[PDB]
Amino acid sequence: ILPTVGLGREYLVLGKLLISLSKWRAKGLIDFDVYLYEYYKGLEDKYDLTLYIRAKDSYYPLLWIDITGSSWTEEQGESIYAILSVKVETAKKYDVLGRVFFIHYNDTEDKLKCISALQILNLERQNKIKKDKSEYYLIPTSYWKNLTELRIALRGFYQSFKEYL
Amino acid sequence: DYILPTVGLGREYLVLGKLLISLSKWRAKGLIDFDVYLRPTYEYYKGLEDKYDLTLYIRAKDSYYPLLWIDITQSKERYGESIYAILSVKVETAKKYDVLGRVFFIHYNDTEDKLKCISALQILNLERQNKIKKDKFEKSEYYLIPTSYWKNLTELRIALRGFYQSFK
């Protein structure tokens, strides 16, 4: 396990995500604990981080998160991020487009930024981003959004599945 | 089995990330000329393996040798100056195994936007000079160390190179 700038950037994003999640819970923004037949078993090991919730004595994955460390640009204007098309196609297959998030840390703005698999496909339909060859979606940082999006999804899908059971 | 997010754990990964970036930049810029290998939590210092948060190894053929051990660890309005508490046992262990200069404590300074460090050796030296104090809160002793006594990662870099050359 050799150090790289990319791996360090990933742990940086993970750290910032954990802090946010903790602060949301403490401030009362989220009213439930998140944890870091088995539902969505095929999504196991597909994404970097899975956010679970307690059903009873079982755990249910609510959101799946992919950590994006280094950008396509900052390894030598606006920062551009490359996101694997396979990650988005998997979210489509398992009908979880709004629950699959990609996250990066913007240094200049000093803030975590997110985008859903749903929104990536939406930007493709609008011809704002395109797939290109392993295919990658090239997504400028302005199309990414702050973690408020993730927080709203977290609460909404929690309420949906709390009702589903 | 399932862990709950905490601000403390988030800060640890943040420090770990910053450390990995720094180590990588030193290697890329030629500030270190050898490969370092991390591991979170005859083989030398096997008793120290579970004692600290991170261990930096170097590749000795197919074996790994630990060069340094690293521990990851508002305050101004409360105490007048920013102070960090380090468990006394962590320093006692460094003394016991005679690795005082190879055991480092690290925190992320948010205002300065930099990682700060101090060695177990430096802590004991400050204690002898009566510059810092040990103290019990409630047992488990703690060294109370103001941020000004901490130093930038250049200290750690010099140690890394020096001890690499020593054991090579």
Tab-separated table of C-alpha atoms in Angstrom:
chain	number	residue	atom	x	y	z
A	1	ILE	CA	0.000	0.000	0.000
A	2	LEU	CA	1.979	2.964	-1.371
A	3	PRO	CA	0.743	6.530	-0.742
A	4	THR	CA	-0.701	8.477	-3.673
A	5	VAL	CA	-2.270	11.934	-3.983
A	6	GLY	CA	-5.452	10.273	-5.299
A	7	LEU	CA	-5.854	7.941	-2.313
A	8	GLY	CA	-5.159	10.838	0.070
A	9	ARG	CA	-7.797	12.965	-1.687
A	10	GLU	CA	-10.296	10.105	-1.334
A	11	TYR	CA	-9.735	9.805	2.439
A	12	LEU	CA	-10.059	13.605	2.566
A	13	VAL	CA	-13.511	13.357	0.934
A	14	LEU	CA	-14.560	10.440	3.177
A	15	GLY	CA	-13.471	12.365	6.284
A	16	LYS	CA	-15.448	15.453	5.259
A	17	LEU	CA	-18.507	13.284	4.493
A	18	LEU	CA	-18.395	11.624	7.926
A	19	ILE	CA	-18.152	15.047	9.623
A	20	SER	CA	-21.172	16.368	7.673
A	21	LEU	CA	-23.276	13.270	8.423
A	22	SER	CA	-22.413	13.522	12.138
A	23	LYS	CA	-23.249	17.242	12.214
A	24	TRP	CA	-26.592	16.683	10.435
A	25	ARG	CA	-27.563	14.095	13.062
A	26	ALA	CA	-26.434	16.281	15.994
A	27	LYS	CA	-28.199	19.410	14.680
A	28	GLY	CA	-31.432	17.434	14.126
A	29	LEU	CA	-31.276	17.702	10.326
A	30	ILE	CA	-31.498	13.902	10.162
A	31	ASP	CA	-33.716	12.170	12.768
A	32	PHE	CA	-32.306	8.647	12.272
A	33	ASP	CA	-28.990	6.811	12.556
A	34	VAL	CA	-27.031	5.978	9.407
A	35	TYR	CA	-24.454	3.160	9.470
A	36	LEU	CA	-21.273	2.591	7.448
A	37	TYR	CA	-33.879	-11.726	1.883
A	38	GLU	CA	-31.017	-9.225	1.555
A	39	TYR	CA	-32.106	-6.153	-0.426
A	40	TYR	CA	-29.783	-4.920	-3.206
A	41	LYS	CA	-27.194	-7.683	-2.654
A	42	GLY	CA	-25.938	-7.267	-6.242
A	43	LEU	CA	-24.914	-3.688	-5.380
A	44	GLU	CA	-22.519	-5.094	-2.752
A	45	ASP	CA	-18.939	-4.075	-3.674
A	46	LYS	CA	-20.199	-1.918	-6.597
A	47	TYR	CA	-19.680	1.446	-4.841
A	48	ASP	CA	-17.081	2.865	-2.426
A	49	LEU	CA	-19.396	3.492	0.522
A	50	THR	CA	-22.866	2.220	1.442
A	51	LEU	CA	-25.064	4.097	3.925
A	52	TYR	CA	-27.201	1.657	5.934
A	53	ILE	CA	-30.142	2.117	8.311
A	54	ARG	CA	-31.532	-0.111	11.085
A	55	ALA	CA	-34.782	-1.882	10.234
A	56	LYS	CA	-34.911	-3.917	13.439
A	57	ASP	CA	-32.045	-6.402	13.911
A	58	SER	CA	-31.238	-6.162	10.184
A	59	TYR	CA	-29.546	-3.438	8.136
A	60	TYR	CA	-30.874	-1.936	4.910
A	61	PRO	CA	-28.761	0.042	2.421
A	62	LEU	CA	-30.363	3.455	1.875
A	63	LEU	CA	-27.780	5.205	-0.316
A	64	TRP	CA	-24.643	4.222	-2.221
A	65	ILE	CA	-21.767	6.692	-2.455
A	66	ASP	CA	-18.769	6.873	-4.784
A	67	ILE	CA	-15.727	8.902	-3.690
A	68	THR	CA	-14.006	10.969	-6.391
A	69	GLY	CA	-10.548	12.081	-5.215
A	70	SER	CA	-8.455	13.657	-7.965
A	71	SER	CA	-10.189	15.553	-10.778
A	72	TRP	CA	-9.446	15.090	-14.490
A	73	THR	CA	-8.133	18.680	-14.700
A	74	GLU	CA	-6.219	19.324	-11.443
A	75	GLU	CA	-3.679	16.673	-12.494
A	76	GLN	CA	-2.860	19.168	-15.308
A	77	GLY	CA	-10.093	27.003	-15.777
A	78	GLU	CA	-13.027	25.115	-14.260
A	79	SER	CA	-12.405	21.705	-12.676
A	80	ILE	CA	-13.697	18.681	-14.638
A	81	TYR	CA	-14.443	15.258	-13.138
A	82	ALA	CA	-14.445	11.910	-14.954
A	83	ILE	CA	-17.098	9.444	-13.760
A	84	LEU	CA	-17.229	5.824	-14.968
A	85	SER	CA	-20.296	5.141	-17.126
A	86	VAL	CA	-20.437	1.611	-15.648
A	87	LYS	CA	-21.250	3.119	-12.228
A	88	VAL	CA	-24.270	4.948	-13.686
A	89	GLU	CA	-25.451	1.957	-15.750
A	90	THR	CA	-25.414	-0.174	-12.577
A	91	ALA	CA	-27.645	2.370	-10.792
A	92	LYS	CA	-30.055	2.256	-13.748
A	93	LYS	CA	-30.123	-1.561	-13.739
A	94	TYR	CA	-31.014	-1.749	-10.019
A	95	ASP	CA	-33.483	1.177	-10.306
A	96	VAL	CA	-31.549	3.287	-7.781
A	97	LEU	CA	-30.590	6.338	-9.880
A	98	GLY	CA	-31.536	8.927	-7.235
A	99	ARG	CA	-29.888	6.957	-4.413
A	100	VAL	CA	-26.449	6.632	-6.045
A	101	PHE	CA	-24.266	9.675	-5.381
A	102	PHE	CA	-20.806	10.713	-6.540
A	103	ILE	CA	-18.885	13.064	-4.231
A	104	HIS	CA	-15.783	15.244	-4.528
A	105	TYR	CA	-14.206	18.011	-2.450
A	106	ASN	CA	-13.798	21.418	-4.110
A	107	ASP	CA	-10.691	23.091	-2.650
A	108	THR	CA	-11.336	26.648	-3.880
A	109	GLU	CA	-14.914	26.726	-2.545
A	110	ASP	CA	-13.911	24.616	0.494
A	111	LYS	CA	-16.989	22.402	0.261
A	112	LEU	CA	-18.135	18.883	-0.612
A	113	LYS	CA	-19.994	18.571	-3.924
A	114	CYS	CA	-22.351	15.799	-5.050
A	115	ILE	CA	-24.263	14.570	-8.089
A	116	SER	CA	-26.686	11.654	-8.493
A	117	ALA	CA	-26.699	8.946	-11.179
A	118	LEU	CA	-30.177	10.251	-12.076
A	119	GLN	CA	-28.845	13.775	-12.674
A	120	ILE	CA	-25.923	12.481	-14.777
A	121	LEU	CA	-28.369	10.745	-17.133
A	122	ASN	CA	-30.527	13.898	-17.064
A	123	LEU	CA	-27.536	16.032	-18.126
A	124	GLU	CA	-26.810	13.532	-20.936
A	125	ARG	CA	-30.389	13.804	-22.261
A	126	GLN	CA	-29.947	17.603	-22.276
A	127	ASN	CA	-26.622	17.219	-24.165
A	128	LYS	CA	-24.742	19.053	-21.384
A	129	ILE	CA	-22.319	16.162	-20.796
A	130	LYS	CA	-21.391	13.134	-22.942
A	131	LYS	CA	-20.044	9.574	-22.609
A	132	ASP	CA	-16.578	8.977	-24.077
A	133	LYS	CA	-14.003	6.171	-24.147
A	134	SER	CA	-14.144	2.107	-20.253
A	135	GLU	CA	-16.473	5.046	-20.957
A	136	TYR	CA	-16.455	8.183	-18.777
A	137	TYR	CA	-18.911	11.037	-18.227
A	138	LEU	CA	-17.011	14.345	-18.229
A	139	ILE	CA	-18.855	16.553	-15.744
A	140	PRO	CA	-17.769	20.139	-15.019
A	141	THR	CA	-17.850	21.186	-11.359
A	142	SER	CA	-20.664	23.740	-11.922
A	143	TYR	CA	-23.107	20.875	-12.671
A	144	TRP	CA	-22.303	19.313	-9.279
A	145	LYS	CA	-24.339	20.420	-6.260
A	146	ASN	CA	-23.859	20.831	-2.513
A	147	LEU	CA	-24.692	18.032	-0.039
A	148	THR	CA	-28.182	19.471	0.616
A	149	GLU	CA	-29.277	17.323	-2.345
A	150	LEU	CA	-27.918	14.190	-0.634
A	151	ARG	CA	-29.504	15.155	2.707
A	152	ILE	CA	-32.961	15.559	1.143
A	153	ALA	CA	-32.599	12.226	-0.698
A	154	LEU	CA	-31.452	10.550	2.538
A	155	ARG	CA	-34.582	11.697	4.423
A	156	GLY	CA	-36.982	11.090	1.531
A	157	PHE	CA	-35.845	7.547	0.717
A	158	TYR	CA	-35.733	6.764	4.454
A	159	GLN	CA	-39.422	7.720	4.723
A	160	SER	CA	-40.220	5.758	1.538
A	161	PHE	CA	-38.668	2.499	2.769
A	162	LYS	CA	-39.927	2.997	6.340
A	163	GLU	CA	-43.351	2.901	4.648
A	164	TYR	CA	-42.369	0.010	2.322
A	165	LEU	CA	-41.931	-2.391	5.266
B	1	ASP	CA	-20.464	-4.892	13.052
B	2	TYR	CA	-21.956	-1.553	11.965
B	3	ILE	CA	-20.274	1.738	12.935
B	4	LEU	CA	-21.881	5.148	13.491
B	5	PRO	CA	-20.364	8.293	11.894
B	6	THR	CA	-18.577	10.584	14.360
B	7	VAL	CA	-16.841	13.940	13.868
B	8	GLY	CA	-13.728	12.450	15.510
B	9	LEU	CA	-13.546	9.564	13.024
B	10	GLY	CA	-14.123	11.998	10.146
B	11	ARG	CA	-11.240	14.153	11.399
B	12	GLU	CA	-8.999	11.052	11.527
B	13	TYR	CA	-9.604	10.213	7.854
B	14	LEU	CA	-9.066	13.907	7.053
B	15	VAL	CA	-5.674	13.828	8.814
B	16	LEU	CA	-4.862	10.479	7.171
B	17	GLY	CA	-5.703	11.926	3.740
B	18	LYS	CA	-3.594	15.054	4.265
B	19	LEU	CA	-0.729	12.825	5.462
B	20	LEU	CA	-0.966	10.589	2.368
B	21	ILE	CA	-0.934	13.679	0.126
B	22	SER	CA	2.145	15.084	1.912
B	23	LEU	CA	4.032	11.759	1.763
B	24	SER	CA	3.209	11.446	-1.953
B	25	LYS	CA	4.330	15.015	-2.711
B	26	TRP	CA	7.649	14.494	-0.886
B	27	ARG	CA	8.283	11.399	-3.021
B	28	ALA	CA	7.230	13.103	-6.284
B	29	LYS	CA	9.341	16.219	-5.593
B	30	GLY	CA	12.350	14.054	-4.634
B	31	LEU	CA	12.223	15.075	-0.959
B	32	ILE	CA	12.207	11.352	-0.175
B	33	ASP	CA	13.986	8.914	-2.513
B	34	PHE	CA	12.480	5.663	-1.182
B	35	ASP	CA	9.139	3.856	-0.963
B	36	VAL	CA	7.074	4.170	2.221
B	37	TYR	CA	4.216	1.775	3.080
B	38	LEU	CA	1.285	2.542	5.396
B	39	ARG	CA	-0.793	0.284	7.638
B	40	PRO	CA	-3.759	1.593	9.691
B	41	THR	CA	-5.250	-0.071	12.787
B	42	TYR	CA	12.001	-11.819	12.391
B	43	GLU	CA	9.604	-8.853	12.331
B	44	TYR	CA	10.948	-5.898	14.329
B	45	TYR	CA	8.767	-3.994	16.825
B	46	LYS	CA	5.835	-6.414	16.476
B	47	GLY	CA	4.706	-5.359	19.977
B	48	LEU	CA	4.111	-1.800	18.720
B	49	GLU	CA	1.886	-2.949	15.819
B	50	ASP	CA	-1.411	-2.462	17.700
B	51	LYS	CA	-0.264	0.513	19.818
B	52	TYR	CA	-0.489	3.388	17.298
B	53	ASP	CA	-2.966	4.502	14.603
B	54	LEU	CA	-0.557	4.246	11.659
B	55	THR	CA	2.798	2.596	10.982
B	56	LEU	CA	5.105	3.646	8.132
B	57	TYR	CA	7.116	0.723	6.719
B	58	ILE	CA	9.927	0.389	4.174
B	59	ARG	CA	10.489	-2.601	1.873
B	60	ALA	CA	13.319	-4.868	3.046
B	61	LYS	CA	13.336	-7.476	0.221
B	62	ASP	CA	10.021	-9.386	0.773
B	63	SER	CA	9.835	-8.196	4.408
B	64	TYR	CA	8.641	-4.877	5.848
B	65	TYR	CA	10.414	-2.817	8.523
B	66	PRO	CA	8.547	-0.093	10.460
B	67	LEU	CA	10.480	3.209	10.395
B	68	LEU	CA	7.946	5.421	12.184
B	69	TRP	CA	4.749	5.132	14.209
B	70	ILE	CA	2.106	7.824	13.931
B	71	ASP	CA	-0.807	8.715	16.157
B	72	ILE	CA	-3.688	10.898	15.043
B	73	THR	CA	-5.027	13.371	17.602
B	74	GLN	CA	-12.885	26.295	21.075
B	75	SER	CA	-9.703	25.519	23.031
B	76	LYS	CA	-8.445	29.123	23.012
B	77	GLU	CA	-11.542	30.693	24.608
B	78	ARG	CA	-11.686	27.768	27.065
B	79	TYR	CA	-8.018	27.737	28.150
B	80	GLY	CA	-6.524	30.935	26.621
B	81	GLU	CA	-4.352	29.006	24.166
B	82	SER	CA	-5.109	26.002	21.949
B	83	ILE	CA	-4.028	22.801	23.724
B	84	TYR	CA	-3.946	19.168	22.615
B	85	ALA	CA	-4.078	16.201	24.998
B	86	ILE	CA	-1.927	13.123	24.310
B	87	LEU	CA	-2.306	9.911	26.351
B	88	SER	CA	0.704	9.462	28.646
B	89	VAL	CA	0.831	5.692	27.982
B	90	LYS	CA	1.555	6.392	24.283
B	91	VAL	CA	4.794	8.121	25.333
B	92	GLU	CA	5.615	5.499	27.992
B	93	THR	CA	5.327	2.820	25.288
B	94	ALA	CA	7.702	4.794	23.039
B	95	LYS	CA	10.167	5.052	25.953
B	96	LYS	CA	9.760	1.354	26.806
B	97	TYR	CA	10.565	0.247	23.230
B	98	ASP	CA	13.244	2.972	22.835
B	99	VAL	CA	11.591	4.599	19.799
B	100	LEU	CA	10.983	8.089	21.244
B	101	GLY	CA	12.250	9.875	18.118
B	102	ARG	CA	10.306	7.541	15.799
B	103	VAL	CA	6.854	7.947	17.397
B	104	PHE	CA	4.975	11.026	16.167
B	105	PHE	CA	1.666	12.612	17.129
B	106	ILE	CA	-0.199	14.582	14.471
B	107	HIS	CA	-3.224	16.887	14.243
B	108	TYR	CA	-4.721	19.030	11.476
B	109	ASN	CA	-4.592	22.790	12.103
B	110	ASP	CA	-7.697	24.255	10.429
B	111	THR	CA	-6.804	27.952	10.816
B	112	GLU	CA	-3.285	27.507	9.394
B	113	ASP	CA	-4.505	24.782	6.982
B	114	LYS	CA	-1.517	22.568	7.856
B	115	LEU	CA	-0.640	19.310	9.603
B	116	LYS	CA	1.326	19.786	12.834
B	117	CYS	CA	3.456	17.139	14.559
B	118	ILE	CA	5.457	16.406	17.710
B	119	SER	CA	7.624	13.404	18.631
B	120	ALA	CA	7.453	11.416	21.873
B	121	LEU	CA	11.099	12.457	22.384
B	122	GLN	CA	10.163	16.151	22.124
B	123	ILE	CA	7.267	15.709	24.577
B	124	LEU	CA	9.507	14.203	27.289
B	125	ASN	CA	12.089	16.967	26.687
B	126	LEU	CA	9.435	19.664	27.195
B	127	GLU	CA	8.282	17.921	30.397
B	128	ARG	CA	11.834	17.945	31.822
B	129	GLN	CA	12.154	21.650	30.950
B	130	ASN	CA	8.821	22.244	32.758
B	131	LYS	CA	7.247	23.679	29.583
B	132	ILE	CA	4.256	21.301	29.625
B	133	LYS	CA	2.451	19.293	32.320
B	134	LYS	CA	1.024	15.812	32.751
B	135	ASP	CA	-2.470	15.799	34.274
B	136	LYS	CA	-5.319	13.419	35.154
B	137	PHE	CA	-8.896	14.405	34.263
B	138	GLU	CA	-10.646	11.724	36.348
B	139	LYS	CA	-6.985	6.234	35.437
B	140	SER	CA	-5.214	7.725	32.398
B	141	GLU	CA	-2.645	10.543	32.411
B	142	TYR	CA	-2.467	13.133	29.603
B	143	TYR	CA	0.235	15.534	28.401
B	144	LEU	CA	-1.359	18.939	27.772
B	145	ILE	CA	0.551	20.411	24.820
B	146	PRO	CA	-0.160	23.905	23.430
B	147	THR	CA	-0.236	24.149	19.616
B	148	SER	CA	2.809	26.470	19.569
B	149	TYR	CA	5.030	23.611	20.827
B	150	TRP	CA	3.908	21.467	17.866
B	151	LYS	CA	5.938	21.721	14.654
B	152	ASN	CA	5.335	21.382	10.907
B	153	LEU	CA	5.837	18.075	9.047
B	154	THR	CA	9.418	18.971	8.012
B	155	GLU	CA	10.421	17.435	11.371
B	156	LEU	CA	8.741	14.147	10.397
B	157	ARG	CA	10.290	14.229	6.900
B	158	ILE	CA	13.823	14.668	8.304
B	159	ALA	CA	13.233	11.837	10.788
B	160	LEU	CA	11.870	9.602	8.019
B	161	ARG	CA	15.007	10.083	5.880
B	162	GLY	CA	17.451	9.891	8.797
B	163	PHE	CA	16.080	6.687	10.319
B	164	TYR	CA	15.755	5.178	6.818
B	165	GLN	CA	19.503	5.715	6.309
B	166	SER	CA	20.237	4.388	9.815
B	167	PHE	CA	18.427	1.061	9.356
B	168	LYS	CA	19.498	0.711	5.708
